[PDB]
Design a binder for this molecule. Structure first.
Ligand SMILES: Cc1cc2nc3c(=O)[nH]c(=O)nc-3n(C[C@H](O)[C@H](O)[C@H](O)COP(=O)(O)OP(=O)(O)OC[C@H]3O[C@@H](n4cnc5c(N)ncnc54)[C@H](O)[C@@H]3O)c2cc1C
Length: 456
DNA sequence: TCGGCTTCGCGCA
DNA sequence: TGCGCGAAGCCGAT
């Protein structure tokens, strides 16, 4: 459908029909940004061909009640900035509240929409809304992958066992799908308050806030400023200051050597394709570039592949057969310690290192990448059953991580607990053949005491 | 029917 | 710290 700098493989049709004479509506869910957004560019290209304006619709659901204020304020503040950025391009944004299956369908009929476009997400709840919208609309419905450099349905048609099988498939498609973004052209034709939604949401989540002994909040909101503009600043500082020594110090939690882009990446406030574009052009350590590109291209987009082809990505069934047989055999093994969800959540275990990892999660909303493996693996070792460990790790990850409720989180937890995208290791009690990590192993790789002292 | 697996632990410079 | 090996199951190039 038209376009020169426009790869049609990024867009697929969800529902055919006659294109109405109304504006093209971009249903924005995952990629909350105005720049480097294929879904917004496709909505603008379609609207240009039909001489109609383009509008953006965001639907606020009740899913914010399952998370904390840290995620709600981070997303809402970025949406207010996004509202001004879209208005400067004469693109109006409508914020609806309620069920997307009921509000999007009612919006299309009331606004006399002609074409519906949405971004892609492999999560289960996103597909449920899409099937409901299809049953309530009669206009064409398109889906755009604006989150991955290579479209998730294009990179692989099946669940990928390991990276070394998915790695050649991704890099072989990079010369085609890695490209600069065209500028978002403003509109020619022009035709709820977010401040009120922010206040109403905060008062709803206030009783569930994570508090200290003196009733002081644990979350520190000054570490990550939300927004499309602030995401660009973080990307620039990583390339200039941190990309060089990323390869050597990425597994040292005592050193702030990560990109810190996951909160913006999860909410779509910055495009991973843009970051890869800037990283590829940077003249930095070749080993560091390969290590970072492997994370933001292979492991990030294999997480989408995992969730897209495994609808039970958050369940014990999604684990590989060897891992399920191993974990089932050790269900009766006596655990050295048993902790409940409340004790895990408050950092009340015998391991100071694990407690320090949980403290970083509660206070900053972003636990270090290396400690997230030790954090999740120890949960498996000190829980009743593999089902309980999976439930507890997912519950804490989605509640307190700014990047939680993400395909990376479910793939990351499945890797740590079920060995997904991993292999078998030495046989052990309780954990079976799943990859093992120990406190002593952390002591030889980084200064464990410094990490503990930083977070009590 | 082999070769190599993200990110492992461990012994040894 | 940095390096080589161990312990393990399996995909995929043939
Ligand atoms: C148990 C566990 C839970 C995790 N929880 C989440 C989560 O809720 N949300 C989330 O986005 N990621 C999660 N991660 C994946 C990864 O640890 C994070 O992307 C990373 O810690 C975020 O910090 P960073 O962007 O500064 O890291 P960087 O080293 O700068 O990573 C760069 C980018 O690459 C991607 N990436 C890096 N590591 C991984 C990985 N192991 N798997 C997939 N993609 C990766 C992310 O998009 C990340 O922003 C989790 C991993 C594990 C093992």
């Amino acid at each position: 459908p038209r376009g020169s700098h426009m790869n049609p493989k990024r867009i697929r049709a969800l529902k055919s029909g006659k294109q109405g004479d109304g504006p093209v509506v971009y249903w924005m869910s995952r990629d909350q940004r105005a720049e480097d957004n294929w879904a917004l560019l496709f909505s603008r290209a379609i609207a240009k061909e039909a001489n109609v304006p383009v509008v953006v619709v965001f639907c606020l659901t009740d899913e914010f009640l399952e998370a904390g204020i840290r995620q709600y304020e981070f997303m809402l503040k970025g949406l207010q900035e996004l509202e001004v950025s879209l208005s400067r391009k004469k693109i109006p944004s409508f914020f609806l509240r309620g069920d997307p299956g009921e509000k999007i369908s009612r919006f299309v009929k009331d606004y006399n929409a002609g074409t519906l476009v949405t971004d892609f997400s492999p999560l289960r709840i996103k597909n449920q809304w899409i099937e409901k919208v299809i049953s309530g609309i009669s206009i064409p419905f398109f889906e755009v992958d604006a989150h991955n450099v290579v479209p998730c349905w294009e990179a692989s048609q099946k669940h990928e066992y390991a990276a070394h099988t998915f790695r050649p498939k991704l890099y072989a498609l990079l010369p085609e799908f890695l490209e600069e973004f065209p500028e978002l052209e403003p509109n020619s034709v022009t035709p709820e308050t977010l401040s009120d939604v922010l206040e109403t949401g905060v008062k709803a989540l206030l009783p569930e806030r994570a508090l200290l002994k003196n009733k002081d909040p644990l979350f520190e909101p000054w570490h990550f400023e939300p927004g499309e503009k602030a995401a660009k600043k973080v990307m620039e500082s990583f390339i200039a200051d941190r990309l060089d020594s990323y390869g050597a110090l990425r597994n040292d939690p005592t050193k702030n050597m990560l990109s810190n882009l996951s909160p913006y990446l999860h909410f779509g406030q910055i495009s991973s394709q843009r970051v890869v574009l800037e990283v590829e052009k940077a003249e930095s350590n070749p080993g560091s570039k390969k290590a970072f590109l492997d994370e933001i291209l292979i492991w990030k987009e294999i997480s989408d592949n995992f969730c897209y082809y495994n609808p039970g990505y958050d369940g014990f069934e999604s684990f590989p057969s060897w891992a399920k047989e191993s974990l089932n055999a050790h269900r009766n093994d006596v655990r050295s310690h048993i902790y409940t969800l409340e004790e895990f959540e408050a950092g009340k275990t015998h391991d100071p290192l694990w407690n320090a990892s949980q403290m970083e999660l509660l206070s900053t909303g972003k636990m270090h990448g290396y400690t997230r493996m030790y954090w999740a693996k120890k949960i498996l070792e000190w829980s009743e059953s593999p089902e309980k460990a999976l439930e507890i790790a997912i519950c804490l990850n989605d509640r307190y991580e700014l990047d939680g409720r993400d395909p990376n989180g479910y793939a990351g937890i499945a890797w740590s607990i079920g060995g997904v995208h991993d292999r078998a290791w030495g046989e052990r009690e309780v954990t079976g053949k799943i990859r093992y990590m120990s406190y002593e192993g952390c002591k030889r790789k980084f200064d464990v005491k410094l990490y503990i002292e930083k977070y009590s």
